[PDB]
Ligand binder design. Sequence first.
Ligand SMILES: Nc1nc2[nH]cc(Cc3ccc(C(=O)Nc4cc(C(=O)O)ccc4C(=O)O)cc3)c2c(=O)[nH]1
Ligand SMILES: O=c1ccn([C@H]2C[C@H](O)[C@@H](COP(=O)(O)O)O2)c(=O)[nH]1
Ligand SMILES: O=c1ccn([C@H]2C[C@H](O)[C@@H](COP(=O)(O)O)O2)c(=O)[nH]1
Lengths: 285, 283
Amino acid sequence: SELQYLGQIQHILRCGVRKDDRTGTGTLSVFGMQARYSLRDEFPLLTTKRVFWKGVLEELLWFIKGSTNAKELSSKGVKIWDANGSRDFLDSLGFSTREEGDLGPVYGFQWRHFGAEYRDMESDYSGQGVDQLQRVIDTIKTNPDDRRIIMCAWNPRDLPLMALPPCHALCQFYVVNSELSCQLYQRSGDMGLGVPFNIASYALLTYMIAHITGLKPGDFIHTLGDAHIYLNHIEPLKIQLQREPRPFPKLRILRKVEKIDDFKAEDFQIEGYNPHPTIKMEMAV
Amino acid sequence: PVAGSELQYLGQIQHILRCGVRKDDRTGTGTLSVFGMQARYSLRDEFPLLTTKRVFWKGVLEELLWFIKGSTNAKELSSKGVKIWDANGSRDFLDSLGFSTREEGDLGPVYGFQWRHFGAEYRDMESDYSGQGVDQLQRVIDTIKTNPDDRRIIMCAWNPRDLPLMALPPCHALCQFYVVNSELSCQLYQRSGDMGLGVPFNIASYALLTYMIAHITGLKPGDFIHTLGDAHIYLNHIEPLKIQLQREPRPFPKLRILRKVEKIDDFKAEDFQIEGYNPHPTI
Ligand SMILES: Nc1nc2[nH]cc(Cc3ccc(C(=O)Nc4cc(C(=O)O)ccc4C(=O)O)cc3)c2c(=O)[nH]1
Ligand SMILES: O=c1ccn([C@H]2C[C@H](O)[C@@H](COP(=O)(O)O)O2)c(=O)[nH]1
Ligand SMILES: O=c1ccn([C@H]2C[C@H](O)[C@@H](COP(=O)(O)O)O2)c(=O)[nH]1
């Protein structure tokens, strides 16, 4: 359960090697990890530290709508991408002609219009590109034993146009005994700030697709590439590691939804979530 | 001591036999399947060519060189004695997918096309794609030489746009490279792995690729992390694998690169020598 995440934190603190990165700060890094989180009658929202669930829900709906505009997500109260869409950051990447908030062809664009010619964030891409999100839902409805149910956000062609290359680069879905499972490949995971957020993110997505396809949520397999702890996250994570985890909350979908695009934020309710106080961990940039 | 050796593969075989659920697949046969597995194989002064069963090393070497050249022609690999792709390029098979206008052997935009010209408009196997697409294979080599701490060293063969034009969607869809202490490591994401026939072949394949890139970039090979999606054992493979599972593995061989190669395209099959490979008889 949650001990698997805490075990990964401990393993990086005890066996992780020092490795500098692009942000100038240091990390303790381990390459190649895998954890398994059950989705059966529980939702893996971490209890040893309060997780920004409101951000998790809005960002996933922000992904599903295909939006690549940081202002669209920030206006919902979730400012997690405002640093990567700011004028100073876009200029540091050479995007002087882009309006502030244009993250480029990122998660939302690749999920819904993979292969389309990206112009800007306010363009209409209807009918353009590959709709991977609907393709995986239809494949599950008709051929649940398929071993190719993959949604990939890593686009080498669109890569130089992205404000930040996708961290959760590829995910695969798996069905057996009417149970829907999902494995995520995260090329680089910020164990302090991003990883707890990403775990609930793809657990919520599996709950959405299971509800649409009438399946029961199974497991979420979290595979990491460069699993790293930033140096300014060492002391906060040592505090979290000394906390006793509480029971995971449960996720209730309030109404019967037929299409993935009809999900609203008011359709989801987290019950029984009593986390420890939040731990401030600053984003590296 | 287990460590990152062949015992991990045998352990995965045992775990699927004991905890794998029955799951039908696209083929007429069944599988015992487990979703989500990960193993670690050391590349330090040894090469993970499995010893509990003889591995088609000639196929491993020729197929990787066939990928590096950007070829999507099954006949080009078949002419080297490796007929593993001949079924997916046959005339009967191409017609069953709707590719009636394709010459026999045209596998479509597959690994060789996606590794070297990702995003280019695919025509056929005899086309010239010079200057078109993203050369991921050269990009990862350049990134390792100049920015080894980069967390984006990724070569991805999964192309949703080119997917309906492929004779077979990529099983090993994405791999990532990692550098620390002058050691090059590689993690592979395999969406579905045949533990009996494919997985031992794929382990040596990407371990050999790590040896090639380490030789060019002047780094030491480290570990190869094998991540699996649908790790499955075919039902007709259960009894042969139970026999292999009762065998004691022998020490891994060593891979020797005979000459100093500067570019990934200059590697020939005669540049590699496997020494000390003593596998068990085939089952
Ligand atoms: N280095 C580095 N760069 C990154 N770029 C984007 C991410 C992903 C990502 C950022 C932030 C969060 C979060 O939880 N944010 C907040 C939580 C709270 C709260 O818990 O009260 C209040 C405010 C925020 C906020 O950011 O407005 C979650 C995922 C990321 C990373 O993880 N690492
Ligand atoms: O969803 C996300 C977004 C970002 N990050 C973290 C991983 C890295 O610490 C940083 C991205 O930096 P690069 O690996 O691209 O250098 O953000 C995550 O873990 N998950
Ligand atoms: O490099 C490869 C190619 C194929 N396979 C096996 C996995 C599956 O058993 C089958 C492919 O079938 P699909 O997963 O596409 O259904 O071939 C491998 O293990 N490795």
